[PDB]
Design a protein around this nucleic acid. Structure first.
Length: 285
DNA sequence: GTAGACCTGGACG
DNA sequence: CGTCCAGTCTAC
């Protein structure tokens, strides 16, 4: 999942698990069934704990639990997302984590490719630095100066895939849709962009992130499609109002755009075995 | 810059 | 079966 996806997941987890007391957490399969995550034994020794907040910044989700008996020394459940990471209220396939709340309330975390990570920490100072390793949230933050792109002599598609330089949240399909809407060649360097192109880029960044956030079914939160429709959306980017009721792929994973123009499966970003495919239309971008 | 790996598939010939 | 495709870290 990505920015709008992870953020929406937090909203759902906030709806069902905020104020709820987590008594136990069990990793029944995957990487964390072979080796325990960092700070696991200390976290279990402090259970049960009460969830206070579930907040995100881009592609990083974390729980904030505390003890009614002691308010201080609150714990944090870090959770980075891979490609097939999904939270759920039921034990779906590839269920890697099981969270046992009070009154038989259950939370499940599924991950097929096992690329998602978990980390437990009772330090707030460590969390603040982790968030500072990530750029501004393109979805949740409305005041992001993206004029910093002009300083980089690198492809714009690589700068948007980056999570520290300009901002965090954007993934593979988002940057493909954004660059298409703004009519920008992904090969074009950020230092060659115009002041108008910059202002136009920031618009579509807000447009695509909000549209992907208000959506109910894209294909990366299948375990929460029923919950996405039974919950409202936070008013991120108030001045931006998409026309679509649902996020449709205009150029990502398609032979042609809605107009019929040719779409290239180009490999601009990455090397060796971490190459990524950037879909784009030369007749538009 | 270029290379690999972590892991488990789905879709296609 | 065989071949492509589908977030982030490490190393020369």
């Amino acid at each position: 999942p990505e920015g709008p996806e992870v953020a929406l997941t937090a909203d759902i987890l906030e709806k069902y698990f905020k104020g709820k007391t987590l008594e136990y957490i069990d990793f029944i399969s995957g990487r964390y069934s072979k080796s325990e995550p960092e700070g696991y034994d200390d976290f279990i020794a402090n259970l049960p704990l009460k969830v206070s907040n579930v907040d995100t910044k881009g592609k990083f989700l974390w729980f904030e639990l505390f003890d009614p008996n002691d308010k201080s020394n609150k714990w944090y459940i870090w959770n980075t997302f891979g490609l097939t990471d999904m939270w759920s209220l039921f034990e779906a396939k590839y269920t890697r984590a099981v969270l046992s709340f009070d009154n038989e309330l259950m939370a499940y975390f599924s991950d097929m490719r096992n690329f998602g990570t978990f980390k437990f920490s009772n330090s707030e100072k460590e969390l603040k630095r982790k968030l500072n390793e990530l750029g501004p949230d393109f979805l949740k933050n409305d005041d992001i100066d993206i004029s910093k792109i002009k300083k980089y002599k690198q492809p714009i598609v690589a700068l948007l895939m980056d999570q520290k330089k300009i901002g965090s949240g954007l993934g593979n399909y988002l940057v493909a849709e954004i660059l298409y809407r703004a009519k920008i060649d992904p090969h074009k360097l950020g230092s060659n962009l115009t002041d108008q192109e910059i202002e136009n880029l920031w618009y579509w960044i807000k447009y695509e992130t909000k549209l992907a956030y208000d959506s109910n079914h894209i294909g990366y939160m299948v375990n929460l499609e029923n919950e996405s429709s039974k919950i409202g959306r936070k008013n991120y980017h108030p001045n931006i109002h998409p026309t679509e009721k649902e996020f449709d792929f205009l150029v990502y994973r398609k032979k042609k755009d809605p107009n019929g123009n040719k779409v290239i499966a180009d490999k601009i970003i990455g090397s060796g075995k971490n190459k990524r495919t950037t879909y784009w239309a030369p007749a538009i971008q």
